[PDB]
Design a protein around this motif. Sequence first.
Motif, PDB file in Angstrom:
ATOM      1  N   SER A  83      -4.247  -2.996   8.515  1.00  5.30           N
ATOM      2  CA  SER A  83      -5.119  -4.117   8.194  1.00  5.30           C
ATOM      3  C   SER A  83      -6.559  -3.800   8.582  1.00  5.30           C
ATOM      4  N   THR A  84      -7.491  -4.497   7.932  1.00  5.16           N
ATOM      5  CA  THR A  84      -8.901  -4.335   8.270  1.00  5.16           C
ATOM      6  C   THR A  84      -9.166  -4.717   9.723  1.00  5.16           C
TER       7      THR A  84
ATOM      8  N   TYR B 225     -17.159  -5.676   4.515  1.00  6.09           N
ATOM      9  CA  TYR B 225     -16.134  -6.052   3.546  1.00  6.09           C
ATOM     10  C   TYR B 225     -15.460  -7.361   3.940  1.00  6.09           C
ATOM     11  N   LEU B 226     -15.010  -7.459   5.195  1.00  2.00           N
ATOM     12  CA  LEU B 226     -14.374  -8.684   5.672  1.00  2.00           C
ATOM     13  C   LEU B 226     -15.282  -9.892   5.463  1.00  2.00           C
ATOM     14  N   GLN B 227     -16.590  -9.708   5.654  1.00  4.84           N
ATOM     15  CA  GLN B 227     -17.545 -10.784   5.418  1.00  4.84           C
ATOM     16  C   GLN B 227     -17.416 -11.345   4.007  1.00  4.84           C
ATOM     17  N   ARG B 228     -17.240 -10.471   3.015  1.00  8.88           N
ATOM     18  CA  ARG B 228     -17.268 -10.920   1.628  1.00  8.88           C
ATOM     19  C   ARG B 228     -15.987 -11.645   1.231  1.00  8.88           C
ATOM     20  N   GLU B 229     -14.832 -11.186   1.710  1.00  5.75           N
ATOM     21  CA  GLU B 229     -13.578 -11.754   1.226  1.00  5.75           C
ATOM     22  C   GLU B 229     -13.194 -13.017   1.991  1.00  5.75           C
ATOM     23  N   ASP B 230     -13.028 -12.911   3.310  1.00  7.94           N
ATOM     24  CA  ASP B 230     -12.618 -14.046   4.139  1.00  7.94           C
ATOM     25  C   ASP B 230     -13.516 -14.146   5.366  1.00  7.94           C
TER      26      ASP B 230
ATOM     27  N   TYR C  40     -13.302 -12.843   9.909  1.00  4.93           N
ATOM     28  CA  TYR C  40     -14.415 -12.035  10.396  1.00  4.93           C
ATOM     29  C   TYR C  40     -14.983 -12.608  11.691  1.00  4.93           C
TER      30      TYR C  40
END
Lengths: 116, 87, 101, 70
Positions: free
Chosen positions: B23-24, B68-73, B77
Amino acid sequence: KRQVASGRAYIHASYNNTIVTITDPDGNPITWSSGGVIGYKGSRKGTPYAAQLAALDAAKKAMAYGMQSVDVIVRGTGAGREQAIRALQASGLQVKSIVDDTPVPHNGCRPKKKFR
Amino acid sequence: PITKEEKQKVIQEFARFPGDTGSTEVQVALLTLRINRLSEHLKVHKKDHHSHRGLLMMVGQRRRLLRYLQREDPERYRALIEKLGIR
Amino acid sequence: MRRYEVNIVLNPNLDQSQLALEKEIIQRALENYGARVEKVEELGLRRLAYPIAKDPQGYFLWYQVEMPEDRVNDLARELRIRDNVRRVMVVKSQEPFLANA
Amino acid sequence: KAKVKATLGEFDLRDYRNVEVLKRFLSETGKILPRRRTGLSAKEQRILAKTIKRARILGLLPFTEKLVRK
RNA sequence: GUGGGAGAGGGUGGUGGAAUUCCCGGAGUAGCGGUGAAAUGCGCAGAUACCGGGAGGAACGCCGAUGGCGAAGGCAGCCACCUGGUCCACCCGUGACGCUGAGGCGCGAAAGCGUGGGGAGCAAACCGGAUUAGAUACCCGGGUAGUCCACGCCCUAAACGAUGCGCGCUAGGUCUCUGGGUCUCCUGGGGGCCGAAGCUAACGCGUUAAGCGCGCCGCCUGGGGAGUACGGCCGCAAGGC
Ligand SMILES: [Mg+2]
Ligand SMILES: [Mg+2]
Ligand SMILES: [Mg+2]
Ligand SMILES: [Mg+2]
Ligand SMILES: [Mg+2]
Ligand SMILES: [Mg+2]
Ligand SMILES: [Mg+2]
Ligand SMILES: [Mg+2]
Ligand SMILES: [Mg+2]
Ligand SMILES: [Mg+2]
Ligand SMILES: [Mg+2]
Ligand SMILES: [Mg+2]
Ligand SMILES: [Mg+2]
Ligand SMILES: [Mg+2]
Ligand SMILES: [Mg+2]
Ligand SMILES: [Mg+2]
Ligand SMILES: [Mg+2]
Ligand SMILES: [Mg+2]
Ligand SMILES: [Mg+2]
Ligand SMILES: [Mg+2]
Ligand SMILES: [Mg+2]
Ligand SMILES: [Mg+2]
Ligand SMILES: [Mg+2]
Ligand SMILES: [Mg+2]
Ligand SMILES: [Mg+2]
Ligand SMILES: [Mg+2]
Ligand SMILES: [Mg+2]
Ligand SMILES: [Mg+2]
Ligand SMILES: [Mg+2]
Ligand SMILES: [Mg+2]
Ligand SMILES: [Mg+2]
Ligand SMILES: [Mg+2]
Ligand SMILES: [Mg+2]
Ligand SMILES: [Mg+2]
Ligand SMILES: [Mg+2]
Ligand SMILES: [Mg+2]
Ligand SMILES: [Mg+2]
Ligand SMILES: [Mg+2]
Ligand SMILES: [Mg+2]
Ligand SMILES: [Mg+2]
Ligand SMILES: [Mg+2]
């Protein structure tokens, strides 16, 4: 005045000279000769003829102290390094053994411009 | 260094579920530990420049996963950053 | 804790009073640094390939231990302190790689 | 001529303490033989070089010797 | 992710022998050294050569390679600690998170500069001896800055593969390093040599492309003047962009 009758003989042969020392089995010298001890003065010292005569001069000097058995040590490369050995076997001195101990560094000191 | 003992302790702490290894959240956690293993190694040994390069690549990769995490969920984050004390 | 191997060569002229002392000193230094000793091999009088401390021989020891890693170089410092102690070589243990197998 | 590994047993290549077998890989001098004379492999020679250097520091293998000839 | 793997990758400390120089002692006479020949130089205050002992600094013979690591510079004794990159087997996890990259920032051989050390060998300048028509040089004897270390600057290069990076595709043969494998071999990832198609002005390149394509940055537009002038930024300066 020593009566050694046995010992070592060091041949330091360079391209500008070949020089021979005769010592006792402990390393302490007895007599010696070189290319300059005999009449030769200039570049003639680093020749195989001078190397032969210098070897034979020290041999007769060692006959005074009574040398018979001789161990031979050689250091360096030079014209007449082999002509000194060959001169020594026939010098009457019974040659015991011949060892090459020419010191080689482990690349520790920076050579002069000539050697690079 | 970083043994597999300490390794598993982080993976299981930041896993989104049992068995999750990639996972991220888990990657950023793992990356951030070697950040601190190196930044504390670089407080001393300030003249170790080749190790300094690997550190810049880890930060770049850590910020690459965070951006990346900022953009999706954006919530997970904030739950991640607040849990690691970053930014 | 990783596993290491210790090589100690000391003066091969000691009587038993000095030999037991030097070695129990080594034991005391291993205790203070947390060295769990796994096995020991003592070769003793061995012909050296070149003169060490003007002496043609050396008395050989070998220990295999498991200890914390950070303390190794301070342990090597502690062993060379003794005058009789001459050679100290500490190597991380490795697998016996075979050849012509 | 023969090669060292050819006339030898199954031995530990990482053992710096076995001089009897390591004496076979030294020349008349203390030098380390080339691969052509040892019959070793690439990875093998690289391990032998380091293990011989270890034995040299322990006074077991000589750094250099004296040639008896010429 | 897991499990393995190779390495002069880096930093820190530690440490081993060979060799040079110098000091001490023993022993030992008349020169050594050096060149195409020589001379300055050194030597009776005893050198060179030999044995022993000691000190100091710097560099790591063989292994050693047409080899390995690194982004490039560049990295060779050995040991240990800290540490980076990378590669393979499993097909496990996230689910396009990717590529390049004007600025910025960081790195950047050698030389040079500052402060303080260190100083064996080597050695600009310079002091000499030769050579020569002359020697402001090549050759020879000496020799300071410096080379080494610490800390801070300097930012240049034939910094070279004179070839930016990433990806995909396009005959093979052979040599090699290192993994895995059902281990005459197959299968990857690097390092070499021949060479299909093709490209190129030619030499030559050719699954490590200089081929066919695609994305992005850098840069080029006749020689001298000139990497100079001016200006600016940077620099203690030398000077750099
Ligand atoms: Mg002469
Ligand atoms: Mg001691
Ligand atoms: Mg290293
Ligand atoms: Mg290192
Ligand atoms: Mg004296
Ligand atoms: Mg004179
Ligand atoms: Mg005088
Ligand atoms: Mg005079
Ligand atoms: Mg005088
Ligand atoms: Mg001094
Ligand atoms: Mg070589
Ligand atoms: Mg490479
Ligand atoms: Mg280069
Ligand atoms: Mg590693
Ligand atoms: Mg899957
Ligand atoms: Mg899946
Ligand atoms: Mg899914
Ligand atoms: Mg990039
Ligand atoms: Mg930039
Ligand atoms: Mg620089
Ligand atoms: Mg410099
Ligand atoms: Mg300076
Ligand atoms: Mg000089
Ligand atoms: Mg000069
Ligand atoms: Mg002329
Ligand atoms: Mg003149
Ligand atoms: Mg051009
Ligand atoms: Mg292009
Ligand atoms: Mg295999
Ligand atoms: Mg290949
Ligand atoms: Mg054609
Ligand atoms: Mg070709
Ligand atoms: Mg291509
Ligand atoms: Mg072209
Ligand atoms: Mg331009
Ligand atoms: Mg013009
Ligand atoms: Mg310029
Ligand atoms: Mg202007
Ligand atoms: Mg200006
Ligand atoms: Mg200014
Ligand atoms: Mg300039």
